[PDB]
Automatic annotation (TrEMBL), chain A:
GMP 1 binds at residues 28-29, 112, 115, 136, 152. It comes from the Bacteria. Mn(2+) 1 binds at residues 26, 28, 156. GMP 2 binds at residues 80, 104, 119, 133, 206. This is 3'-5' exonuclease. The keyword Nuclease applies. InterPro entries: 3'-5'_exonuclease_dom (IPR002562), RNase_D-like (IPR051086), RNaseH-like_sf (IPR012337), RNaseH_sf (IPR036397). GMP 3 binds at residues 80, 104, 119, 206. One of its GO terms (biological process) is nucleobase-containing compound metabolic process. Keywords: Exonuclease, Hydrolase, Metal-binding, Nuclease. One of its GO terms (molecular function) is 3'-5' exonuclease activity. Mg(2+) 2 binds at residues 26, 85. Mg(2+) 1 binds at residues 26, 28, 156.
Length: 207, 205, 204, 205, 206, 206, 206, 205
């Protein structure tokens, strides 16, 4: 709840809550096209049940404490569908995180019995946790976010550590750890390809 | 042009003391778990090619495999995603120093959606590739002259294409992008073998 | 409060305003086959006028006066259709318009749902019921549910336009929007002339 | 066929003291944010053409931009939606006096869905445009003769096409419709550059 | 509380059908007349009652029903008569030729929608709810359930009232002669289906 | 070597058309009758000659042509008459109602193919090559080119011969009454197109 | 609460399976047998109880289970046996060849619908509600949840009753020999899938 | 090329004292309940063929039906699924000893999706089949020479194709698979006649 959500303008005040080896990251934007739709919110969690919700201003190009986390190679950044978050973060702040774990890719490599790899479905199946998608289609650029917006934004990062632990168990069980690591290693370049103009192209397809 | 046809393996590596080798395969089809490797083609880029027939059930070819495993030799493919899969499935070795002219074309020939080898050879080299023998019995005990010449044609021009694509990648400042794609390409081939050949592992849905 | 009229507004006493919300109801989406049945208006004050248009009716002077008045912005949701049927029926094409569908497509970039019900729910927390959309709009006597539906289509457009204007300004798209609104009458004319299925600007 | 080839810009406007100029562009692809402007072609309609090679990183072209900004000169394009976008993106100036033969074709050649320049030139003028060089490296330091002839053919006939389409627009009483379309075209190109290139802004859904 | 008379094979007589128009529907084992037999024929005079006639496997005759179907003084009202006409003609060898179809009528009058199903039409025109739950059931069963019997009856209980409304709309929009021509071709459209053209719009360019 | 008489406005008289069936085709500015005007009407008596009639912008009458179109003792033969009937009725205010359509006949007889265009039918049944190059041309041109005129004539030169062969096949496969009912509805199918149903198969379930 | 016996590796014995027909289903990590391992085999004698057998990663034999699968005197009942047969033969090396499939049976008899899933069939023929919630779950888990165990049992608890009804319908519609032939080919259809034709209808023209 | 044309039936079985017979049909179309059987073609594989015109309403063809019922004679088809249906529909006898070159192609030519008789004849035999007469009036009282040659060409090569496919089925160890497909083929044809022609009975959905 709000007792464990901290809301910031522009950047984290410091990294006191992020002296950790992995951080859960998500974004909210005005849409899915980074060259048109600005970054509006960045959400973080340490995995301790709290979240930081950082409002990004129009035209903002810097956030040194957040960007230090994104650049710190000793901290794994956990995303759900990091392909998008990596693109908007690199586009906005000029830094592409390069140590990452993605729960969507992990799901596609382990939940081979379904085609539903969205966060809501994964949190339901793996954690019995209910995620509401209601605030996803809202004005994330508003000067003041609603309480429902803040709690929705925070819920997208509160569970990614636990999902990562379970997916790592499954990847070990099915002997796919090196496959997953190679996908994660390429994911920042997949994001770059999107920013450069190949967002509709599977670069590995025959045609 | 000279085309040397071999059974099982190269006799030696005397023509392949080189830094990059052009490689293609022919099979009974596109499903490596069903369709066996039938031919491996090589060229040093000198205008000659080696066409190696692979027997049913064959799982070794020491001279060929030495080249495929040699980290100091770049293996040049057109659509290496497939060739890497069938080579690793057959011989147990996954090359990890590669250049793929299809990926290179997709990163440089941004004005077209035609990234096949025939189209690329015609545009960049004014070389005409015939596709007629693509649909043939590559498992035949004796290949026809047309099969042999088609198989050789798939590797005779890859060095020249690689040089041009490298120029374009530099010109448009996409060298690090291409290198990352080539670095992931063996794992993309691995994903295909393990059961994800119909899945873009990076797509949202 | 909904005021129901036969044929035309009795007068323009309620419409000495800078902008008027407009919608239509018809027998379907093909102006050459499907007649104009209803024109709805609102001044923005939470009341509406619902004008039943008779089969074969060729004029409505008070309504056409508003539609032709260049000092009054006509607000539509998907004006592309309303402009076509109004011009086809009464012979006058409005040329000072604001369309909340176009404005939504220029500002609600986070969704592909640009219908009026979705927009009212999101921006106003107003629930639009679509149940009476598929009904006999040519009926001699409209049902209360029809009348309330038709009015609901115009009662909120002023409030939507104010919000969309703020977003257009925030994202610096005011002049893009203005140009789209400027072309919308000719887009409607293109539909009437036989290009309704053609994006005239597409390559193919 | 006299084709004058320039680096960067026209040397002067001596050939373009005219009321309408035919304009085309060649690029590395259809995405202006990725694919740079490589060539601008111009014709006064006298049977000659100017082919201007645009350098990578080139930000200005004062003589060409003078024509593009001159409100007394109609810029004639075939599918100006694209040309307007890449020119405005590259040099910062959006022409606002335009005629587009693709829009004119769609408003007059109502008996067909084939509105490409090759089709239009064949039907209206019995002139055969070859499309072979369309897929080529338009960023090459030296364009080939075939490339230069292709680039010129894109502009050599637009004046003649414009005259015929104007007659058909008059005959079918669609002049004001065409004029409104041409007037919105720069904003349609702007919409593309801003991120709506895949969206018919006027569609219901 | 709807009175539904269930019969084996045929109506016992035509006492309830000395009328100018009869509502007709069928139930079958599926939509392919050469494979899927006619199982049920439903009739209503429009008086709020219905007759539900179970057709046996291999049954080729039902003289009282077939008299109604052949009587040119009686308009047969269907919803999507294209199918019912086909299965009735295939089974009994008689093609009704005086018909009214509420689906065609809807397509010519409810121009503001693409939803021309009976359930949607009954809801809009009459504020009557049709349940579709029993549509996919074993219509060949020796004993139909009450749910099946009520479903079969609901298909015919409202066609007279629908026809009256559609006739008013056809007159208002001046489409009576258009509809009449469509109804007159409908038996031949059904015949075309039986002959092998069921997947072909015979009037299409391609 | 083929006699093609070109007229402006109308036939000068009916001297060449004291016959029991006439082949008819149209050319227009496109497939939308409300936007795309009738530009040409072509006729042939079946004697290897053709009349090509240019129709002016806004022209609404053509008394000799319309006498033929209205004459119930003269069958009008079309290929895809569905369209020709629509534009002719739209322009001249008369709907021909004694018609034969070689496209419908082909669909009812050439059951082994889905290629029912005039070029394919002429090649298969007559070994006659029809060129389509001039189909996409400006049929409103004040002066038609020789190639346009020959194309327009070729659309009507062979319809009698096609009709005779299709009538043999309809007889052989016993589909004459089916074809006749299709031809009888075709004017109303054209009317439906003009009234706003040109994209709707009025007989489809959905 | 249903009696469900949960086993590790194999049935302890065949004492509950001295019967003429056994209901069989499987659970796996997915639909690709060369990637997705067999995790569970479920059995029912038809007495309202089930056996749920957890199959370990890398397990290559299950002697009692395979005895049933290879017993030509015991009909193996599946719903969509095409998949179960493939994963069973791939895992244990034995292809059952005396089978009945309720999915094929449904396609041959429930001709009035295109919904041939187990849930829809159980709802219609038995008024039994199958929940599909646990279908997407980690079937490889060391400890299956009670929800998983009940779901896995529900897939075999009703197949005897369905088979009885479908045999009645196949007889009513005179399709017993067609159905038998389909069941006899089903093992080879599963083999074709394992060999690389899982996406190919081997009998299609193209 | 000797083609013997008969009315109704073979005059005798003198040319068919053989272990395998090549069979094809021609019809008025693909719907056996509407489109009658018009022609039945036979070849012993000796490079000659018999073309049997079947009359409208003909219910009997005793010599042909003797061959179709003879369990000592394999009936070779290309796409026997259809021919089996129209033959059983017309004469009441379903052959149950069959070989189908289309099924055999799908089981062996795994490198292509082109399994038509023309493609197969060109690849395996270098024989060119013309499809021109396929769309013709097969019900004509007098077939043209081109029709008769087309119908003969459909059976003249099936023995030679069967031999090659039998070699490939052996090579790839798929003989039992093919045999089971051929043994279900009559029931697949029966399924089509009973009303399942648009349904893959084995599909999940
Ligand atoms: N191409 C895409 N398709 C769908 N969602 C996308 C997307 N690109 C980015 N997203 C966003 O990335 C996340 C996808 O999550 P999911 O897999 O559950 O659909 C969502 O963000 P949020 O989680 O911040 O709402 C979604 O809005
Ligand atoms: N999914 C696929 N689609 C098309 N070709 C594929 C393929 N997988 C492998 N290939 C083969 O990889 C090469 C693709 O080449 P291209 O891009 O020109 O189509 C071809 O081999 P060959 O070059 O040996 O004929 C082709 O047979
Ligand atoms: N091509 C079209 N598609 C859908 N609705 C259309 C339409 N053309 C006109 N309309 C009508 O214009 C409005 C579109 O609204 P929306 O964007 O919410 O779907 C609706 O009118 P009403 O608001 O009067 O019902 C609808 O009936
Ligand atoms: N979305 C698009 N689709 C197709 N062609 C496009 C295009 N955008 C720009 N073009 C280019 O605009 C012109 C379209 O021409 P056409 O209508 O004849 O197809 C071509 O340029 P060029 O004429 O310089 O080759 C084409 O390369
Ligand atoms: N091609 C078809 N598509 C859908 N329904 C069809 C059909 N052919 C026949 N029917 C049946 O005709 C009626 C269609 O009605 P509707 O338009 O409301 O969908 C239904 O019968 P019932 O009304 O007896 O259930 C339906 O089962
Ligand atoms: N919807 C449509 N689709 C295709 N052709 C159409 C058509 N409507 C009218 N036509 C015209 O009707 C005729 C159909 O011919 P076909 O069956 O050979 O394609 C052609 O005329 P013309 O013969 O005068 O060129 C064609 O131009
Ligand atoms: N291609 C496929 N499509 C859908 N389900 C498939 C399938 N292959 C195997 N299955 C499985 O076979 C059964 C199909 O059931 P249905 O016909 O009701 O959809 C399901 O198993 P379970 O019954 O054990 O869940 C499903 O998981
Ligand atoms: N569903 C179908 N699709 C295509 N052809 C079919 C068919 N059913 C039957 N046929 C006929 O079966 C043969 C298929 O051949 P192919 O595989 O080469 O396309 C052809 O006959 P003919 O060979 O006698 O002409 C074709 O006319």
């Amino acid at each position: 709840s709000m007792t464990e959500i901290r809301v910031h303008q522009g950047d984290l005040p410091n990294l006191d809550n992020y002296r950790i080896d992995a951080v859960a990251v998500d974004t909210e934007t005005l849409g899915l096209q980074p060259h048109r739709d600005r970054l509006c919110v960045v959400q973080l969690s340490s995995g301790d049940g709290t979240a930081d919700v950082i409002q990004i201003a129009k035209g903002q190009k810097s956030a040194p404490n957040l960007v230090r986390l994104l650049s710190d190679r000793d901290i794994t950044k956990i995303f759900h569908f990091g392909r998008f978050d990596l693109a908007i973060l690199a586009h906005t702040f000029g830094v592409m995180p390069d140590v990452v774990f993605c729960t969507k890719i992990a799901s596609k490599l382990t939940r081979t019995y379904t085609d539903r790899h969205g966060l809501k479905e994964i949190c339901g199946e793996l954690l019995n946790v209910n995620i509401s998608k209601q605030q996803q289609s809202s004005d994330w650029a508003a000067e003041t976010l609603s309480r429902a917006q803040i709690e929705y934004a925070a819920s997208d990062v509160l569970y990614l550590h636990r999902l990562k632990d379970i997916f790592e168990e499954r990847l070990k069980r099915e002997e796919r750890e090196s496959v997953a690591k190679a996908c994660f290693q390429f994911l920042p370049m997949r994001a770059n390809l999107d920013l450069l103009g190949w967002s509709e192209i599977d670069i590995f397809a025959h045609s």
